[PDB]
Amino acid sequence: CHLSDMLQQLHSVNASKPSERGLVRQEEAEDPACIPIFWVSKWVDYSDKYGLGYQLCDNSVGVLFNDSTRLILYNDGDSLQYIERDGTESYLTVSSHPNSLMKKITLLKYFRNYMSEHLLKLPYLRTWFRTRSAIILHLSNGSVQINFFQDHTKLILCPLMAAVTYIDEKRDFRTYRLSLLEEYGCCKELASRLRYARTMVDKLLSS
Secondary structure: OOHHHHHHHHHHHHHHOOOOOOOOOHHHHEOHHHOOOOOEEEEEEEOOOOEEEEEEOOOOEEEEEOOOOEEEEOOOOOEEEEEOOOOOEEEEEHHHOOHHHHHHHHHHHHHHHHHHHHOOOOOOEEEEEEEOOEEEEEEOOOOEEEEEOOOOOEEEEEHHHOEEEEEOOOOOEEEEEHHHHHHHOOOHHHHHHHHHHHHHHHHHHHO
């Protein structure tokens, strides 16, 4: 996928100014085929010398550690992917009891347990950061997801299908083709989030 493609998809929709229209026909911009399969349903920020733990919507879990390593637990509850700092991927099982990785497995079980019990609502978490408005979550498959704190509104940007999922204040899950947003327009809310999203993708590109 790519952030560059995303930035342009957002510039292009934001340039269309989709909320400044007589008739907005947002429903007409929905495309069931862009409905994403993966997104982050849960996250825990323990970036104080542990890291960021998360759960995808298929109940897999992952954590991006502070040492820039990542450990991914598939939803079978056993299959691990471990990604070294340098990008090198190995596959193991929790049950195999790999001693070099027990501390991180334990942190992952901590995150997983915490998330099952205390939060509601394979690509891994490439980068994230926070901004007082949102957490921004960039998956390895190119998706970026911005969760807004005040609202609990969420955007799942999917650059392979030039698409966006927006989760309303009402928990409505609606998927749009960005170019269809250009044609048909959308509400001030979505438009304003896509504006924010674009600045967020600059920040992801910047690093």
